[PDB]
Amino acid sequence: HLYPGEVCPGMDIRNNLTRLHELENCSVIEGHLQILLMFKTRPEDFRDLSFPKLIMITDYLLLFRVYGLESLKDLFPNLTVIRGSRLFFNYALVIFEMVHLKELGLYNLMNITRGSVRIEKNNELCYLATIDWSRILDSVEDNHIVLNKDDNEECGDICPCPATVINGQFVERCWTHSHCQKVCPTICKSHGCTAEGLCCHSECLGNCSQPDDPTKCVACRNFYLDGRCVETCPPPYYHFQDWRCVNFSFCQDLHHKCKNSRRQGCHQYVIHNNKCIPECPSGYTMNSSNLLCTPCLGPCPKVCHLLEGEKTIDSVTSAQELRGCTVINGSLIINIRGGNNLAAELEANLGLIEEISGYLKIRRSYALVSLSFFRKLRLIRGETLEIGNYSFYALDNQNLRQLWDWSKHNLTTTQGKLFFHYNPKLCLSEIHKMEEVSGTKGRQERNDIALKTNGDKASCENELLKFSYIRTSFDKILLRWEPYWPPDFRDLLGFMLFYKEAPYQNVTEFDGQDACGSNSWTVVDIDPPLRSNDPKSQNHPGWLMRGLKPWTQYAIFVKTLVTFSDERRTYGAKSDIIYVQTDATNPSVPLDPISVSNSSSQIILKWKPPSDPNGNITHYLVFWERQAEDSELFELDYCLKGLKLPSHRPFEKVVNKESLVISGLRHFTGYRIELQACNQDTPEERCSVAAYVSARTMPEAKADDIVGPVTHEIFENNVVHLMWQEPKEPNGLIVLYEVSYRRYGDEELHLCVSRKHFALERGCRLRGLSPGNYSVRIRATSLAGNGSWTEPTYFYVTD
Amino acid sequence: HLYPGEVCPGMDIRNNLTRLHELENCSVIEGHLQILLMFKTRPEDFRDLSFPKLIMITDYLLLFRVYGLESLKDLFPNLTVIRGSRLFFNYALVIFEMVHLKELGLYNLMNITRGSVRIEKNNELCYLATIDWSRILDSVEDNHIVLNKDDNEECGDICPCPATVINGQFVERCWTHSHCQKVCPTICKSHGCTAEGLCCHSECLGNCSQPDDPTKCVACRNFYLDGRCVETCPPPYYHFQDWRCVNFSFCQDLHHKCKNSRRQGCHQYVIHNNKCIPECPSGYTMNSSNLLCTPCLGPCPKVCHLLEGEKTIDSVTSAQELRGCTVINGSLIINIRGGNNLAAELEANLGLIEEISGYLKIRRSYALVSLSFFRKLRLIRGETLEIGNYSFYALDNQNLRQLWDWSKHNLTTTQGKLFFHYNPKLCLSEIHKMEEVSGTKGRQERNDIALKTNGDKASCENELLKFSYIRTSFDKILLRWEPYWPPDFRDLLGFMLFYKEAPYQNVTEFDGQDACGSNSWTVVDIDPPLRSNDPKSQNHPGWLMRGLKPWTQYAIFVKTLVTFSDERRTYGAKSDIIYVQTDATNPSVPLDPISVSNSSSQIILKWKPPSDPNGNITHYLVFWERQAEDSELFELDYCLKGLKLPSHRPFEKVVNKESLVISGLRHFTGYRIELQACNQDTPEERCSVAAYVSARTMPEAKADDIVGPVTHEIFENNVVHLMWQEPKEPNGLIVLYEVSYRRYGDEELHLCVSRKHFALERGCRLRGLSPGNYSVRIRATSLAGNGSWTEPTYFYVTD
DNA sequence: CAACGCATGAGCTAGATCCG
DNA sequence: CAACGCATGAGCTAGATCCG
């Protein structure tokens, strides 16, 4: 037979060898097999136990913390395939922290459908590299076999298997010292094979009896049907867990077995696409008689039979199933004890609930203020009741002030009784208008819901306050609202301004409860104003707040305060919030004005936007000034040690950019650059303070040097006067001429004529002149640097 | 007469000149006279009033924001002296933005006691350079008269006063065009004077009618007594404001005038060393009848008779003017109807009171978790009783959780009845506890304290719980306590465990009236234990907690929990709080290791205490490493552009300090400095990671330059070889020799010899040396900088 | 009779319908 | 018979007398 044995559910084994005895006649195990934590076991009570008739594995096998095993092949001698239907710990088969196992001996395994193997912290195993996972494990890139006895080549590795050359070496792969890993010709990869190499039926695997037969081999691929198995059997039967196809009359009765809410390992199995699947996916709803899934027109419920029909919920873990679980056949109970933030998690998990049939109970609430997370709820059937016939319950909750927004919500109760006791944070108004929309109208207990233990410590109010005038500056906001007096005007404590910035308008609404929050609305108290007894008076109260960054959206309102007294009046008033931004003074200074000059006529200035823009800046205002050189540097003797070498005003309204280039300016001249960041211009023209920077553009290559006829006059005392021309537009200013003369065969003897010396003499002179042929050359050394050399003027003075 | 007028208290004028009329007959002003805020005033209402009787000033005279005064001389024609008792922002007399004032007219000031004059922003004043303040103001170094009408010399400045030459100019000092500044001969600087210049009595000032008489002049220096004044008056009278002396019967009445707490600007005047000082200084306490300040052995009270023997301090302020009060002579009623946070403020405000005489009524508390703020209360006398002879009263307190810790507290009530009603979360044992510790044992009412309306809505558990073996680690503590079972061991819910760290032991008990505060005892619930039906069993339950910090004290206790029931039984049990500190470990890293170099052989290093000590750190472990220079810099041609210029291993157990210097080290080398903060050492020697910094000390003055016999060898080709020696201990390293040779009549031409060139040649050569007398001088330029120059070695090479 | 004048704008003097 | 062994120590496997 393919599988002549019996079905066998997955099961867990710990702390005893007693509960393994339930594997006497099992052949195929659905689920997984976990056996672990086995310390006080003599090793020799394992040699006399085995499970030969067990073949198939669906999910996984695990071995962890065993004291006494040496070779599990004595217990698992015919095991061939792991289906790997579920990945556990991102792995399939794991042997961890073994203490006594010498050799593995899984000599019968052929294929791993899905998953990976992992053997760790086992300093007693050998032949771990004689495995060839690639043949068995279709995916090897995740195999993790480290920190074992094979950390050092010290365990033998001797065995009598073709010794494949899958790697670069002629490695021999064996299971034990008495078992190799059988390999036949690979004409068929995963379709079963014989010892003689003859391939068996394509749709079966493992060891084989007769080739090309899907009925007498061992294990097959797709499904199973009564000694046969085909890729897809005809739909008189429906497929089950990708391993069978059997008639729905059986799994319908399985659905009827634990439809009694007794165990949570069950699933409300449903037929869909000829699959008795646990749940037909989203966008589908259930039917009563035909056991199919209707495509669920709209976001309709699917369904969900509550645990024990009375299950309580205390955390998100106790509400994980609610995703998809929409119609509830039980009584819900909620009690969060502590918690940090669940108001953003319930909607993603239970914001899709519409119908419950039991009764709802709330107690010991700590960190909740509303019931808005209950989005799609519409009705409670109340087939089961609390003691005293209560369809709803609410005791000892000290933080709830809100249930639903009944201007847009609708709930109905079929029957039962309401409970509201010791909920001191919710006014009588809400629960009375709970009764308006709820099914009950006069069904009260007497003593019904507590009328004194609830809402006593928090004074509810249904009164509003409106504003009268608002003025804003860039930094200060002028607030003013209408006056108000309580029915007893002396009974009044003042006003509080709760205010902060709000870049959006999705701001949290005020609830009157103080939790441990770092972020809180800064608030100031306002002295109640003088009583004027005049309707036409200055009784309108207000306040001016000044510590505000400009152009930020601020949410503001004002809340009254009055003492609590015996009479249930003077509830005060509460003003709704409004949004206000500031005014638009001149922005802050422009930041980082960077000036760069690359050529003699180009200067680029780039800045950074002002730190405080004070609104949308319309433009930028730039200004430049042509600086002047020093007049003190004209009268220095520049052949003495020490020489210098440096590197209305027109404007534009530069807009919509961050840099500006200015040309048509004097070359090699200092330029003081200033820019004012400036807001909207035509009304109330005000700009920032100018960020001042200095800039000097590049000099000109020819400006330093001067060309012209350098003439000479020879005096009688052999003192030759020299006449030439100065640079009309030098690079900054001429400071020194590098005048020099040369005899043929004589070096460049240079002389000095100062800027003033050239000015007073209109040239220079060469006293004590040797008779001969001299060439006079002049270099115009500007403060920007030395210029070019003039033409060496030839003149011969003879003996 | 000397001082024939009337005493006149300091007074202020604003927005109306009406109240100035109270200066009709007072000639001496105590305090200060402020005149300010006069906008809508015609200038014509001023020439009809004057004050020819007032002379002296104590604090300061201030004229500010007046619209219409052009000459204040029409109001102050005779006053001459100002004492400046209290500095007005470190000044004495100010005119500050006066708009109508043409001429000041202070033609009568004689002398300045202390302070400064300041005249500002007056574009209508002249003659301000004609004052000669140096003759009247004792301290000129702080005069500030800027930005006035005489910022420009444009107002005339003519006057008919000897034209003093105090400065380098013949400055003519005049007050007005009709009055100059009067100066008589300076034989006596401040001993009074007449028009003819002869000096009057030594102890008086300014004007004078008959000379050399303390009774026949106008104003004197030290004191005053019935038309006379002496340096120290006889002690039948006692000095007042160091300018009079009056009988004790006078200022005892001043003490008794505002012993009635009506105005807070006065003081309870006391006598000390012939001074009716407002308060005898710290460490001195008054006596009742004598009004003398006892030397106050040890701490002494300020004493606080309650206002009208009855007060209802309820809020933050209430009667906040009571800091320092210790004993109260009335009765108090406290009621904080809400509030934000006062727990951290009462101790600094009222946390020093010990005794009250009346009764205490407490009601409507909302944020009062305990009464530990009443730190020093010891006894209640009960002079006034509430209706029904009630001394203690508690009513409708939803957050008064606890009263006191009697193990470290003692309170006694002499008489009266105690009231405690409708406080629904405070149990029955502690009110018995305060009953037994207090005087009363059987003074009850029928009905006395409510036995049901209190502690019913909270699971009060005061019944006994004791712990068992406890175990602790560096991070975790193992807990276990004695088993408890209610009289019905079926009615139960389990345990909850509150904990929080505490650097001290003045921690509030968990005490159970729900106050949602920012800081609260974080709690974990416990599954109630199994029933074993054996007294000798494992019934002791425990718990493991891990999220803790090492070396930190933590308070812990356990509490039972049970379902509510109609029967008043199964009250459960509760444990007392205990302290168990966590264990120490390695400290944190040493912080901010700062190394400073002051000499070549001293290197000081200072650090900061580690952030986490983890126990009492016994010492600090320090180490260092001798860094080496870079060997790659030896083969660099330093004459080319680019030069560099910088600025087991032994140890010691540095203890009980923050810095330590290291001596005995080589000159100018880098050092790697590492220091470990470390806890107790001889057992479990564990220290943290070392804080690593670097340090290089300064070089040696002479180590850079080398001295020695610099001999030379002249070759046949006029190429002279140079022989000299290298510095044995260069500062860091020698890198280049600044070799140079200078012929007479020629410049000191410099040549080059590299570090390796000097190595391969043991010197340098001079190729192309013209015949002459040459002086060779070398400067040893190391990486630490240039050394000294050698001697220019004279050698003569001939033609 | 519906911003500015007749200060400044949160540094021992009061606190923006604050004032007209 | 009163820490350690025949794990680790809060990352889908249990939660420190937790197993002797």
Residue numbers in the entry:
A (entry chain B), B (entry chain A): 1 to 160, 169 to 655, 756 to 907
The article reads:
Upon binding to the insulin receptor (IR) in peripheral tissues, insulin activates the receptor, triggering intracellular signaling cascades through the phosphoinositide 3-kinase (PI3K)–AKT and mitogen-activated protein kinase (MAPK) pathways. The α-subunit mediates ligand binding via a leucine-rich repeat (L1), a fibronectin type III domain (FnIII-1) and an α-helical C-terminal domain (αCT). To understand the basis of this aptamer-induced full phosphorylation, we determined the structure of the IR bound to an A62 dimer linked by eight thymine nucleotides (A62D-8T) using cryo-electron microscopy (cryo-EM). Our analysis revealed three distinct conformations of the A62D-8T–IR complex: arrowhead-shaped (IRarrowhead), pseudo-arrowhead-shaped (IRpseudo-arrowhead) and pseudo-gamma-shaped (IRpseudo-gamma).
The second class of particles forms a modified arrowhead-like shape, which we designate as the IRpseudo-arrowhead. In this asymmetrical structure, the head of one protomer (protomer A) is lifted from the symmetric IRarrowhead conformation, while the opposing protomer (protomer B) remains unchanged. This structure was resolved at a 6.26 Å resolution. In the IRpseudo-arrowhead, two A62D-8T (A62M) aptamers bind to different sites on the IR dimer, which we refer to as site u (upper side) and site l (lower side), respectively. At site u, the L1 domain of protomer A and the FnIII-1′ domain of protomer B simultaneously interact with the A62M aptamer. At site l, a similar interaction is observed between the opposite protomer and a second A62M aptamer. The head groups of the protomers were arranged differently, with a 13° difference when measured at Q177–L459–V604 (L1–L2–FnIII2), as protomer A is raised relative to protomer B. The distance between the E204 residues (in the CR domain) of the two aligned protomers is 32.7 Å, while the distance between their Q177 residues (in the L1 domain) is 30 Å. In protomer A, the L1–CR domain shifts toward the L2 domain by 6°, as measured at Q177–E204–L459 (L1–CR–L2), whereas no significant changes were observed in protomer B. Consequently, the head domain of protomer A becomes more compact, with the distances between the Q177 residues and E204 residues reduced to 16 Å and 9.9 Å, respectively, in the L2-aligned protomers. Upon aligning the stalk of protomer A between IRpseudo-arrowhead and IRarrowhead, we observed that protomer B rotates clockwise by ~11.2°. Due to these structural changes in the L2–FnIII1 and CR–L2 hinges, along with the rotation of protomers A and B, the distance between the membrane-proximal ends at D907–D907′ is reduced from 43.3 Å to 30.1 Å.
